């Protein structure tokens, strides 16, 4: 039978390179075609320079279904997770994520349509670009933001971005981004000298201080949640928040946090923080905390 060559032409007509399509088993071709058709259906619903859009992204796009089927993943996912598009499309998302998150994913696929969460996906790529296999896999925290929508049922379109590791930095950091180091209770223990010019604090006086005293109370609900995520998944991105400035006022910040471990005893040592100052000192006349008044 020439059904093998019918599959050959099916894979060639599938939208991907020939070198990837022809090294494909039967059930894999069936999976790919089914998912492409269902993605086209939802795309007809939603819509009624490819390399530029793709390589300009700090993450990968994924549309998953209510039953958890990843009916489409963008090509760049490999660049971030190692696992490639053909290896993942058609499979259930629960077969690739940390089980300790599954319920949370289960609660973002259901049913306001906006979604913003953190999950842990399998990752077989290393910081060197070299790729290991499924049996030896590292968890990678992804920040997923998207919308759940209904077609004719439900599906979830989310961008998933990885959170850079402060040690393995690959992008430039500007004048108003600076590093900070904390214990796991978020108590300050190291900070960059840029904070003196940016917020007015001298690194030394912050050492040993709880960061919970230095943020505007209105943001507490965000911050604690981030801490909690940071302690359950090891990485987090905060929302925009206000850190009180030295001589009154505050400054707007967004910071990524990563739990870093000791390589020799594999215990968590401390937390890194890449802080993005988003403004200048606002309301510099108003004081809000005792640390500012004692500084008048």
């Amino acid at each position: 039978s020439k059904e093998t060559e019918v599959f050959y032409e099916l894979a060639h007509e599938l939208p991907l390179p020939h070198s990837v399509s022809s090294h494909l088993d039967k059930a894999s071709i069936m999976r790919l075609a089914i998912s492409f058709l269902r993605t086209h259906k939802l795309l007809s619903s939603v819509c009624s320079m490819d390399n530029l859009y793709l390589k300009a992204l700090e993450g990968f796009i994924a549309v998953v279904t209510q039953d958890g089927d990843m009916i489409f993943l963008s090509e760049n996912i490999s660049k971030f997770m190692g696992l490639t598009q053909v290896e993942l499309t058609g499979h259930s998302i629960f077969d690739f994520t940390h089980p300790c998150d599954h319920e949370e994913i289960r609660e973002n696929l259901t049913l306001s349509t906006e979604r913003d969460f953190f999950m842990r996906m399998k990752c077989t790529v290393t910081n060197r670009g070299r790729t290991v296999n499924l049996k030896s896999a590292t968890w990678k925290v992804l920040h997923c933001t998207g919308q759940v929508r209904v077609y004719n049922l439900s599906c979830l379109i989310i961008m998933c971005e990885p959170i850079q590791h402060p040690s393995h930095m690959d992008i430039p950091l500007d004048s108003k981004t600076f590093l900070s180091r904390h214990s796991m209770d978020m108590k300050f223990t190291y900070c960059d000298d840029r904070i003196l010019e940016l917020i007015g604090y001298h690194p030394e006086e912050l050492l040993g201080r709880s960061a919970y005293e230095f943020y505007h109370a209105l943001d507490s609900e965000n911050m604690t949640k981030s801490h909690q995520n940071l302690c359950t998944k090891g990485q987090v991105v905060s929302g925009q928040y206000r850190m009180l400035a030295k001589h009154g006022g505050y400054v707007w910040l967004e910071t990524q946090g990563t739990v870093i471990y000791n390589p020799r005893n594999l215990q968590p040592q401390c937390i890194m923080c890449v802080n993005y100052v988003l403004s200048e000192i606002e309301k510099n006349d108003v004081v809000f905390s005792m640390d500012q008044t004692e500084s008048l």
Binding site: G146, P172, M184
Partner: protein
């Protein structure tokens, strides 16, 4: 195994009416082939990005910041017409306090490279929205990027040590009690309470620490800058460090009653 293959062929046929007496397997294979030949372009990807993260693409010049390309998506993210953006520089569309940072991100002195930053861009008395920009450089020197919008009185709140000293107080105090924040910080809250009520207040504090996490409640006469006794309800709970469970402080919401 065989069941999975059969379900695969059927679900293939399931969504395609053209082939759906359901025919020989080979015929539905060539059927999917022919139906796909009739049919991933860039417009669907643009809408996928706009759906997922409310982002839009733009290409600017690394030297003069004049934008060489803005996608239509600029209109729903910022309510700003395409005609505005095209023909201008990013410095004009960015908050004036954010130009220097822009200057560095557009610099070619330091380093095919990748860029990722945050700024505030004005949308359609001005208003600015926070935008995360991720992109790379392209000779065309230019910056290709996607900018996205994440976007996800009668009382005043205060923080206290377990003793009752104001260690944090929000500005709304000046309207509720009449004091500037500086006259409250460093002083115990029982200093501003009517003596007849003071004991009650103290009890509540002892109760919020014994009953951690639980919110407690007390009503007392607070002295204002105008020296008037104003009745006030304070709902107080202790906050604990989510890692070590250490009590960071006590949060109170002092509400005029």
């Amino acid at each position: 195994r065989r069941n999975k293959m059969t379900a695969y062929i059927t679900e293939l046929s399931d969504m395609v009416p053209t082939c759906s007496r359901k025919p020989d397997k080979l015929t539905i294979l060539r059927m999917a082939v022919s139906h796909m030949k009739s049919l991933l372009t860039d417009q669907e990807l643009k809408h996928l990005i706009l759906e997922a993260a409310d982002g839009f693409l733009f290409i600017v010049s690394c030297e003069t910041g004049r934008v060489v390309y803005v996608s239509d998506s600029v209109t729903p993210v910022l309510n700003q017409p395409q005609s505005e953006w095209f023909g201008s520089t990013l410095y004009d569309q960015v908050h004036p306090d954010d130009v220097d940072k822009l200057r560095e991100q557009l610099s070619t002195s330091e380093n095919g490279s990748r860029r990722s930053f945050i700024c505030r861009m004005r949308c359609g008395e001005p208003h600015f929205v926070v935008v995360h920009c991720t992109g790379y450089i392209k000779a065309w020197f230019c910056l290709v990027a996607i900018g996205r919008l994440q976007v996800t009185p009668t009382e005043f709140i205060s923080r206290h040590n377990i003793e009752g000293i104001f260690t944090f107080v929000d500005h709304r105090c000046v309207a509720t009690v009449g004091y500037q924040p500086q006259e409250l910080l460093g002083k115990n809250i029982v200093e501003f309470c009517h003596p007849e009520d003071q004991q009650l207040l103290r009890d509540s504090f002892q109760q919020v620490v014994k009953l951690k996490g639980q919110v407690l409640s007390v009503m007392f006469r607070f002295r204002s800058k105008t020296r008037e006794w104003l009745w006030m309800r304070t709902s107080s709970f202790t906050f604990q460090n989510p890692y070590s469970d250490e009590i960071e402080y006590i949060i109170c919401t002092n509400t005029n009653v």
